[PDB]
Each structure stands twice: as structure tokens, then as C-alpha cells.
Amino acid sequence: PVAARGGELTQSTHLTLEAATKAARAAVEAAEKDGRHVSVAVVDRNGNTLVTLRGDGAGPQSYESAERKAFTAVSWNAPTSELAKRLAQAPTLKDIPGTLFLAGGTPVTAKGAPVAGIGVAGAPSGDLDEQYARAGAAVL
Amino acid sequence: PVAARGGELTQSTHLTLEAATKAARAAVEAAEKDGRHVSVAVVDRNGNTLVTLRGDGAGPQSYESAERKAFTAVSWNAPTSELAKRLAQAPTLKDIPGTLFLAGGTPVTAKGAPVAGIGVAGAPSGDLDEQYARAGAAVL
Amino acid sequence: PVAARGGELTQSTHLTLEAATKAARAAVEAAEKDGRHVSVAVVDRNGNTLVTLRGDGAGPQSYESAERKAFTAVSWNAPTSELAKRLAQAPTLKDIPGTLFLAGGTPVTAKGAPVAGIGVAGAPSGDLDEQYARAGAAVL
Amino acid sequence: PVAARGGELTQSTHLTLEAATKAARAAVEAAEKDGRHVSVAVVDRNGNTLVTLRGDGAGPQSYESAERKAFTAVSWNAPTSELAKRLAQAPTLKDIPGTLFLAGGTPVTAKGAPVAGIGVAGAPSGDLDEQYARAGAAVL
Amino acid sequence: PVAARGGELTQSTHLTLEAATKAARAAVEAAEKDGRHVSVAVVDRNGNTLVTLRGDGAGPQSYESAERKAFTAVSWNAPTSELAKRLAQAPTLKDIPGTLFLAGGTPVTAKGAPVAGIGVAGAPSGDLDEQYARAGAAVL
Amino acid sequence: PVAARGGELTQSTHLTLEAATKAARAAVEAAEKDGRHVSVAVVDRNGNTLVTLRGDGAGPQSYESAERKAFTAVSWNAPTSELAKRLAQAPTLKDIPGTLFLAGGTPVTAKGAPVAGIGVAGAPSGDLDEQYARAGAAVL
Amino acid sequence: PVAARGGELTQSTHLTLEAATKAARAAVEAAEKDGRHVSVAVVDRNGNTLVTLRGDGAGPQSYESAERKAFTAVSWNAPTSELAKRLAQAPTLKDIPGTLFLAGGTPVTAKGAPVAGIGVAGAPSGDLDEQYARAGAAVL
Amino acid sequence: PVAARGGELTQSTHLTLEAATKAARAAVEAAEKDGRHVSVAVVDRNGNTLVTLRGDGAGPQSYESAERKAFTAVSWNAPTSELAKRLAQAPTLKDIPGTLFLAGGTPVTAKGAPVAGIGVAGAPSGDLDEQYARAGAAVL
Ligand SMILES: [Fe+3]
Ligand SMILES: [Fe+3]
Ligand SMILES: [Fe+3]
Ligand SMILES: [Fe+3]
Ligand SMILES: [Fe+3]
Ligand SMILES: [Fe+3]
Ligand SMILES: [Fe+3]
Ligand SMILES: [Fe+3]
Ligand SMILES: [Fe+3]
Ligand SMILES: [Fe+3]
């Protein structure tokens, strides 16, 4: 390996696995408290899934749904509930690969920049999903 | 967005787009000097493609080949020529998704840790591909 | 293998292959009685296909259509005819991977919880598809 | 929904999300103690991923590698280190979709039957990966 | 091999390769006469592509577009121009895998039953595409 | 629709859904008699899956394995146990998409020509899988 | 190899890698001047990606978005901002594989015929993306 | 559209659709003369399929097999029978995406450079497949 240096290098910021896990677990716990069955994903700004947790009894569609919501939230640094509303004036946003413009994903930032998204799916409504996503973010 | 802080955060190091582009271009130029027609990819340690360049006249198999070689080199922090030899004692390494254990990818490090791979494909041999990959890394 | 125990374990409920097959066959028979040509799928709540049957003369689009309808019905524990109507107020539900919000899938429960979906496709209308799906469920 | 009953129903056994998470976390912790950077997956016998955790600094190939190892271990109820050796007399086992016959996955049972696999990838050898997988299973 | 017999067997009807080729070529020729650049596909009722022809200068999106139109036409035994209009009252028809509800595919029958679809893409409008598809069918 | 006629048409022969189902069920029953847990697929010579049945307790890898074995057997009109042995002198046969050169698939013919393959997976050996596949074919 | 000749041959025109790279780099530079973080792709009329550049800090959805926009622009020889408006009277255009009908892709021609598309994604609006795409084309 | 000029442009050479079709048809005819049932593909050096023809009675694996052989032959400008032999000293060549290192593909050149590959599959041996591929090339 050549070693790069130095004006050739840049840094990015991430949740640690420990922090992403804590947040994911908090979202599951919040759903469980309410008798809901959800899957939860935490996705890095660099578009990698860091944590997934499939709740007991969660619907089989919820796992990928949670992942895509998280990816979508971190991509636009916005809750997916709000992003869904953007489809009114830009309906083809939802044609972008890997996205899901449906309430339940919320971003997490560091220094004003998005670093992760937390996505939840499996509750009876996207708005409830997003409540639990926010509960996961809240522990950070 | 919740803002994370701070023991909850970690940093990683990357080539800038400028540096990845310079390296990719150098690999193409080295092949072109020799009358070779190659594709070149630079892939981050976080497994994202940063740059691709498809050489004039490069075979159609070369584009994905270059990408996979780069990914493989950065995953193991080793030239793919050497990694290919590991298949003698661990033949199922090559079953790992997204990999290509074939000469032509080389890693680039920062602070001793892998940060990118440069992959080249399209020359008459993997060893020549890897020569041009090293020529790209050499400018960093 | 470590053996897990015991507060660490939970149970889920499923149709037996025998029951899923009986239901699938009944849906085909109901379509055949009417001179219709359908494919039928039974999909578990855990999102696995348990049975598929491709009717003689069924259109080539019907096989995957039936599978996706079944998956969709068991995911929301609701007939897909009704789920399709939810798209009026949540249009991006249909962006969830693996789903098909089109009449012809119906859920089957045990103890109040969804355990399988039966999906039918290939009839001249989704409503007819769903008639045959219900005929399959009816034998359980 | 028709409600099924009763000779038409069967039960299966699973790790709870709580147990799968505890095991995954233990595998990560064991790797971290040794200064290793791994991804960990827990996959149910019904072939669904229940938990994934991407270690800080883990190679980008490790995430899918861990998932596939877990799936492979639970499919044959055997450590993937041993399964790899079966390729000597059945070399096309590795052509089965979704599999990875490479040390690092280990099964977990309940009542003598496989219920989950734990897969680890990212250490310098499959044998080390499998050490950490066993450390995760050990807490169950 | 066991040999099946006989109440266990059924027959289906197909275009010969010779006939499918003649039709595809006629569609290309009709487009070429008009200075249009199209791709053409003939897809069997059993959902297999029998012939593809990529016109000189045809857009890169046209090849798969033609295939999907042909598949869609033979699946519903109707021109895709008409099928597109069905989306007004069944908008999720277009979520069925492998389909394209866009003018340019037309069915071919034998004994009243659909046996193939011919699909064309690459002209300035779907209606023109479908003109050339009909020109291909017309030689049968 | 243009109607084709007549030197433009050819016929092919198939198992009826009824026959394919009978055979699949017989293979499952033979495995169940022995306390084995298998998936079974019947695939037409035209490469379409006609029937799948997932046995109670069958490993999650078995479903696709059974499908691919059936496809492979009907493609070469030979048991996959024998086809696997061909890899000695043509090792890249197994690189052909959709194939699985592993004991457990067996062909069924009509008029000397292959019309279907029956594939079984999930038993402790491919040879046992193929025993149950033959038991399914035997009822035809 | 047989050598073809000569009425059997035709020529097509392309951007050189050098030109495609210059254009891609100009689009990135234009975004960077404005403090925007984008990915840029140049896609040939024959539907191959020639260059990709992932901007520092660009969202993870931007890379594929840029590629698809470029492909879409070169397929119809029109800016994707305008193509998006065509969805009003042909809504299923967007069902064509590989496309993205969202502002940010612009075509480049030679002799009146499209030879490449330049696509940009990652800015706060498609219209801004398309500004930077035009800035890349402008250097040619 | 910006119009590019001129040191920014390069040309490539291709078979016309007419020539590719003539060659494909000749390969089918040669197989048919011998009572063989094959699929045939012609793939451009730029990696696009130009023509496919599925022979009456051809195995379902033959269609993709023919396509991949053609792609492989044009990528290395060599018959796939010879390329297969290269696997002895570079066994991971076959891990390159989209390839099939199995006799039956042959290249076609213009001005010494590869412009297309013709691939055939479905005969009882790769060597016979390649005979028919050569018969198709021979008419050019
Ligand atoms: Fe509730
Ligand atoms: Fe040379
Ligand atoms: Fe091998
Ligand atoms: Fe009818
Ligand atoms: Fe829509
Ligand atoms: Fe170490
Ligand atoms: Fe025109
Ligand atoms: Fe046993
Ligand atoms: Fe801004
Ligand atoms: Fe013969």
C-alpha cells in the first residue's frame, strides 16, 4: 500500500456501533411498551446499514421497510413523514433507488450534518413508526 | 434531528474526491502510455465506489471487474494478486459477495489503516492490470 | 451448538404444509370450476412461500403476482382489495419491497394473529382472484 | 380472515429478539476485547435475519459475509468450519443460493433442533471469526 | 426418467422461431422505412423471450422496454395501449413484476388464445411503437 | 390480435398442474415417511416453476435448492446426480445461470422428450433427496 | 475470428474518456463552488457508464440517482427536467427500467445525435442538479 | 444539448443489425440441419445484446448461456473453448460478472479489433455449440 497524505485525506463522522445499537434498542423498547411489533434499522450517512433488529412478531415487510426509511431520512437529513409530502411537487423523488418515502425514518446529526438515519416499520401507521424512531434517537 | 454527542461519535478517514480522481486518472494514463485499454475504479474502505473511468476501447467486462477488484483490495488491505493466492488454503473466500480475487486491485492506506482500493481491469493479464493500479496509487 | 433456554425462546404458529396445500388446491379448483386459469400462492407470516401452484393456461405474470399478493395480505392481516384502498391516504405503502396492493390476496389467522396469506392471480379481475383466494381459505 | 384450526396448525421455536441481540452483542464484545473489527448476524432457522451489527472499522465485505455464514450454519445445523470440509466430497453444496461455506457461523438449538445461526466476519481468519461466534452463542 | 402418460399431459401452442423471427424482422423493417430506430422483442405466452432485435441507433432503454411490452401484451391478450388505460380504475396493475403498461406491445393468438406478444420501443411515441408492432404481427 | 396460422405454429407437451402436484406431493410423502423434512419443486421444460411445496421443518436453503435442481434436471434431461459428475470434464457447466449440479433433481419425459424436472432438497444427502424425487416421479 | 466486411459494418460516435472526464469534473467543480455536494455520472448513448465521481459529502442516494438521470437524458436526447413533464400525458414512461425522470440529467450531442448524458444528484433541488450538469456539458 | 467537437469525439465500429441477424440465423440453421435445438445470441463489443433467437425445443438454460458466451468471447476476443483453458492458470477469471467460460462463443472482428461475439448453447456439447457459432460467423 501506498500511504496517502494529507491534503489528499478528509474525515467523516459516524455513530459508534455502541450508540447505533443503543438507539435501535430504544426504538424497539418504545414499541414493545405499547404492544407494537416493529423492525428497526440504523443506516449511516454513507448509506451502510449499521444495525438491524427484527421485533418479535413484526410483519415480514417491516425489515426492508425500516432499512429503506432510515436510508431515506439520512439521505435528505429530514424525517420521512416530511419527505413524503415533497412528492406533491416532485413525484419522481420516490423513483430514486433504495428509497422509501413513508413516515417512520428520522435523521440524527453531528455538527449540523446528517450522520445516521433510524427507521422503524411494522406499527399500524407510519406516524406511530416515526414516534418510535424518535424515541430511539432521543437516547442519543 | 437529534444531535449526537460525543462519546457516541467516531471518525473515519477517506481519500478526497480530488485524490481519488488523480489516482484513477494516473492509472488510466499509465495504461494508455502502453497502448492498453482499461477501466479503473476507486472504492472506499466503506465499500462505496468513489470514481470510475471506462477507458476508450476497454472490454465490457472490465468495468465491474475493476470495481470488484478495488472493493476486494480495500476489504483485506492487500493486493488482489496476493489475495488470489490465499484461495489455495481458503478456497471459499471467493464466495464472499462483491469480491473478485484476481490480480489488479491494490490498497491505499492512511495511518496504517486501509482507506481505499484502486482496481484496474482490461489489460492482457491481471499482473499488468495491477501494474497500472500501482501507478495510480503512486501519485498519492 | 449451544442450546438456548428458555426465557430466551418464543413460539410462533403456522399452517402445516398439508393445510397450506389443501387451501391452495381449493383455490385452483374454484377457479377451474369457472373456467379460469390462475396461479395460487400460500405465504407464511414469516414471509416464506409455502406452496405455489401454476394453473394450466395461467398468464406468465400470474405466478409472481399471486406470491406478492399473499405476502401483502399476511403482512397487514387484511385482504389486498382493502389494502389497495389505503393507497388513497398513504400512496407510498406500495413502495415497500415485495408487496402488491392489488385485489386477490386474503389472510388466514390463528388465535387472532395472521399466520398465512393466500394469493391468486390470473383471473379477469382482482375481485375474481380474491373470490378464489377466499374459496381456498374457506376449506381451513 | 378465515381462522385455521387446529390439526391444520403447527408450532416452531425461535430465539427472542432479546436473546438474539444479547448473543450478537457478546460476539462483538469478544472481538472488541481482542482488538478485532467484525460484523455479526443472527439468522433464524426460517432463514430471516433477526439481528445485524456492523463493528466499528469492520471491512465492507464483512456484513453480508456474516449474514450468509449464519444462514449456512442454521441450514445444516453445523459450524461453517465443518461444513466447508464437506466440499471435498460434495463440491457443489456451495452453489446453493444464499450460502457461504467459510468458517465463522455456528448454530444454536432448542430441543435438539436448530433455531438460529450466529455468523461473524471481519477477523483475520475464519477460525477467529468462529471463535467470536461461539462467544456470542455462549451467553445463551 | 419416468415417462408420463397421458391424462397427465397437456399441450400448448407456440409461434415457431421462424414465425417469431419473421414478425420481429417485419417490425424492424417497418420502423426503418420511416427512419425510426427501435428494438423489437417477441415473448411467448409462457413468458419466455423468443426473439430480440436491437435496431441500429435504438436508444439504450428500448431493449428492455420492448421485452416488457411484449410480456405485458401476451399476459393480458391485449395491446399495451389499451392496457395502459386500465390503470385509471386499477392503478396497481403496473406493480406486477415484469410488466410495462405503455403503448407498443400487441398480442398474437392461435385458436382464440394468446400465444405471443410483439413489443417495440424506441420510436418518438408509444403509439408509433405500436404501429410497428402491428406491422410485425401483420405478416403472420 | 393477429391470429397466426399454421405452418407458423408448433406444439409442446407438459405435465398438467394436477400431475405435477401429484408428483410433488408424492415426493414430500416419501420424505415424511422417513422422518425427513424437504422442499420439492416441479419445473417445466420451458423453465417455469409449476409447483413448490415447502415441507414442515425443511431448511431455509432447501426451497431454492429444490427449484434449481429441478430446472437443471429438465434442462439436460438427466438426474442431477449424474450431471454433477460431468463437472469433472466440463467444470464450468455449473456457471450456467439458474443451475445447481447437486443430486436431487430427476427428469420426467413424454414421447422421449423432457417435459418436467422434479427437485428435492433438505435431506441429509443429495442421494436421499434424489430418492424422494424419484418417488415423486414414480406416481406418474 | 471471422472478420466482418463491410456493408456489414456501421460506426457510432462517442465522447472520449478524456472529454467525459473533463465534463464530469466541471460539474463537480461548479457544485463545489456553490458549497454543494453532488455525485456526477456520464453515460454513453449505448447505455454504458463512462465516468462516475462521488463528491465529498454527497448523499448516498446521489450516486445511482446521477447515473440514472444521465441514462435517461441520453435515451430521449432531452433534459430530464423536461422529460419529467412528459409524465403528465404518459405516466408509465417512468416504468421503463433504468430510468429516472427527475431534473438533473442533460444530453450531449454530436452531428445532431445524442452521444452521452451527464447526470448530477445531491443538490437541494433537481433544478440545481441540472444547473451543474449543464456546467459540465458547457466545457465541451 | 451542448454539441461536442471534435478532438472530444471518437468512433467505434459495429455489426449492423442486418449482419448480426444474418449470423444468428445461420447458426440456428446449422444446428437445425443437424437436428439440434439451440439458442443463439449476438453481443456487441460494448457489451449490449444485439440479437437473440431461441430455437424450437432449446433447453431453458440455453438462452442466458448463449448470451454469456457471446459476451465472454467479445470481451477477450477469443473463442470461449480456448478461454476455458485459461482457467488452469487463472481460475478466478470466471468470477468476473456476466461471463461464461464454456465452449460455444466465438468473436467477430473488424480492422483487427473485436466488434461482436456470437454465442450458442443447447447442443449436447460445448464443442458442438461452438461449431454452430462458427457457422454463424462464417456468413459474415
Ligand atoms: Fe395495535
Ligand atoms: Fe497488447
Ligand atoms: Fe470452483
Ligand atoms: Fe373468462
Ligand atoms: Fe405512481
Ligand atoms: Fe490483528
Ligand atoms: Fe423522427
Ligand atoms: Fe435423519
Ligand atoms: Fe445549501
Ligand atoms: Fe442429438
Tally Cβ neighbours within 10 Å of residue H34: 14
| Declared resolution, Å | 1.6
Cell of G19: 472529454
Residue E51 in contact with partner chain H when CB distance is under 8 A: yes
Distance CA F8, CA C1 (A): 62
Cell of C86: 389505503
* Residue E82 backbone dihedrals phi, psi, to 5 degrees: -75, -40
- Residue E32: which residues within 8 A CB-CB, separation 6 or more? E55
Q: Which candidate from C61, C121, C126 shows the least CB-CB separation from E98?
A: C61
Is the sign of the CA dihedral F9, F14, F18, F21 positive or negative?
negative
Confirm if F132 and F53 have CB atoms less than 8 A apart. Answer: no
F122 dihedral zone (left: phi>0; alpha: psi -120 to 50; beta): left
The one-letter amino acid at E135: A
SS3 A99: coil
SS3 H59: coil
Measured between beta carbons, the chain A residues lying within 8 angstroms of B10 are 13-16
Cell of A129: 413508526
Residues within 8 A of B (CB atoms), G 58-77 only: 60, 63
Paired residues of G106 in beta bridges? G118
Residue D82 in contact with partner chain B when CB distance is under 8 A: no
Confirm if F79 and F103 have CB atoms less than 8 A apart. Answer: yes
DSSP string, A19-38: HHHHHHHHHHHHHHHTT---
- Is G7 among the domain residues? no
Residue H90 in contact with partner chain B when CB distance is under 8 A: yes
Residues within 8 A of H (CB atoms), G 10-39 only: 10-16, 18-19, 22
Distance CA A23, CA A18 (A): 9
Confirm if A47 and A71 have CB atoms less than 8 A apart. Answer: yes
Paired residues of C54 in beta bridges? C39
Asked if chain E contacts chain A via 3 or more Cβ pairs within 8 Å, the reply is: no
Record: contact D46-F60, CB cut-off 8 A: yes
Interface-testing mutation among G10, G14, G92, with chain E (most E C-beta atoms within 10 A) = G92
Distance CA G75, CA E123 (A): 11
Is the sign of the CA dihedral F67, F72, F77, F82 positive or negative?
negative
Closest CA to F21 of C16, C24, E13: C24
Distance CA H9, CA H29 (A): 40
- In this complex, the chains that touch B, judged by 3 or more CB pairs closer than 8 A, are A, D, G, H
Tally of domains in chain C: 1
The one-letter amino acid at C20: A
Measured between beta carbons, the chain H residues lying within 8 angstroms of B101 are 92, 95
Confirm if E95 and C100 have CB atoms less than 8 A apart. Answer: yes
Burial of F113 (0-12, 13-18, 19+ CB in 10 A): middle
Q: Which candidate from C3, C9, C137 shows the least CB-CB separation from D14?
A: C9
- Residue E128: which residues within 8 A CB-CB, separation 6 or more? E34, E36
Distance CA E24, CA H32 (A): 20
Confirm if D14 and D115 have CB atoms less than 8 A apart. Answer: yes
Vertex D45 angle, CA D43 and D48, to 5°: 45
Confirm if G93 and G101 have CB atoms less than 8 A apart. Answer: yes
Cell of D93: 453444496
- Is B9 among the domain residues? no
The rounded Cα A72 to chain-centroid distance in angstroms is: 7
- Is D115 among the domain residues? yes
Distance CA B105, CA C34 (A): 62
C-alpha distance from D128 to closest chain A C-alpha (Å): 20
Closest CA to E59 of E124, E104, E108: E124
Polymer length of chain H: 140
Residue owning grid cell 429441478 = F70
Distance CA G115, CA G91 (A): 26
Closest CA to E31 of E132, E117, E102: E132
SS3 C82: helix
Measured between beta carbons, the chain F residues lying within 8 angstroms of C63 are 48-49
- Is E8 among the domain residues? no
E51 to E40, E60, E70, E119, H74: CA distances (angstroms): 8, 17, 11, 10, 21
Tally Cβ neighbours within 10 Å of residue H104: 36
Residue E109 in contact with partner chain F when CB distance is under 8 A: yes
Confirm if C83 and C112 have CB atoms less than 8 A apart. Answer: no
Cell of H84: 476455458
- Residue F82: which residues within 8 A CB-CB, separation 6 or more? none
Distance CA A137, CA A27 (A): 8
Distance CA B54, CA D39 (A): 33
DSSP string, G1-34: -EE--STTEEEEEEE-HHHHHHHHHHHHHHHHHT
SS3 H17: helix
The rounded Cα E102 to chain-centroid distance in angstroms is: 12
Record: contact H75-B60, CB cut-off 8 A: yes
Q: Interhelix angle for G17-33 vs B17-33, to 10°?
A: 170
- Residue H33: which residues within 8 A CB-CB, separation 6 or more? none
Q: Which candidate from A16, A53, A54 shows the least CB-CB separation from D56?
A: A16
Q: Which candidate from C57, C62, C102 shows the least CB-CB separation from E93?
A: C102
Confirm if D131 and D22 have CB atoms less than 8 A apart. Answer: no
Cell of A81: 413523514
Distance CA A58, CA A52 (A): 13
- Is D102 among the domain residues? yes
Measured between beta carbons, the chain C residues lying within 8 angstroms of D116 are 4
- Is F133 among the domain residues? yes
Can you give the CATH number for the domain in which C40 is found?
3.30.450.150
Measured between beta carbons, the chain B residues lying within 8 angstroms of H93 are 102
- Residue E60: which residues within 8 A CB-CB, separation 6 or more? G45, G46, G47, G71, G74, G75, G98, H48
Q: Which ligand is nearest to the CA of A95?
A: 5
Record: contact E61-G47, CB cut-off 8 A: yes
Ligand 1 centroid to C103 CA: how many Å? 24
Record: contact C102-E113, CB cut-off 8 A: no
Measured between beta carbons, the chain G residues lying within 8 angstroms of H47 are 48
State which residue of chain F sits closest to H95, comparing Cα positions: F95
Closest CA to F62 of E75, D45, A40: D45
Confirm if C14 and D10 have CB atoms less than 8 A apart. Answer: yes
Measured between beta carbons, the chain E residues lying within 8 angstroms of G99 are 61
The one-letter amino acid at A84: A
Residue owning grid cell 445484446 = H49
- Residue C128: which residues within 8 A CB-CB, separation 6 or more? C34, C36
Confirm if B68 and B100 have CB atoms less than 8 A apart. Answer: yes
Distance CA A98, CA C51 (A): 29
Asked if chain G contacts chain E via 3 or more Cβ pairs within 8 Å, the reply is: yes
Interface-testing mutation among C67, C75, C92, with chain A (most A C-beta atoms within 10 A) = C92
Distance CA C113, CA A101 (A): 28
Distance CA F115, CA A9 (A): 61
Helix, strand, coil share of chain E (percent; to 5): 40, 25, 35
- Is F129 among the domain residues? yes
Structural domain including F27 reads 16-140
The one-letter amino acid at B64: E
Measured between beta carbons, the chain D residues lying within 8 angstroms of B110 are none
Pairing assessment for the beta strands A105-110 and B2-3 based on DSSP bridges:
parallel
Confirm if G5 and G122 have CB atoms less than 8 A apart. Answer: no
Record: contact H8-G46, CB cut-off 8 A: no
Measured between beta carbons, the chain B residues lying within 8 angstroms of G56 are 14, 16-17
SS3 B10: strand
Asked if chain D contacts chain C via 3 or more Cβ pairs within 8 Å, the reply is: yes
Distance CA H28, CA H98 (A): 23
Confirm if H12 and H46 have CB atoms less than 8 A apart. Answer: yes
HSE of C19, CA atoms in CB hemisphere, 13 A: 27
Measured between beta carbons, the chain A residues lying within 8 angstroms of C96 are 61, 64-65, 68, 100, 102, 121
DSSP 8-state class, residue G94: G
Residue owning grid cell 475504479 = B41
Is there a cis peptide before residue F6, judged by omega within 30 degrees of 0?
yes
C112 dihedral zone (left: phi>0; alpha: psi -120 to 50; beta): left
Q: Which ligand is nearest to the CA of B94?
A: 3
- Is D46 among the domain residues? yes
Record: contact C16-D5, CB cut-off 8 A: no
Distance CA B87, CA B102 (A): 11
DSSP string, E32-93: HHTT---EEEEEETTS-EEEEEE-TT--TTHHHHHHHHHHHHHHHTS-HHHHHHGGGT-GGG
Record: contact E18-F11, CB cut-off 8 A: no
Interface-testing mutation among B53, B61, B62, B64, with chain G (most G C-beta atoms within 10 A) = B53
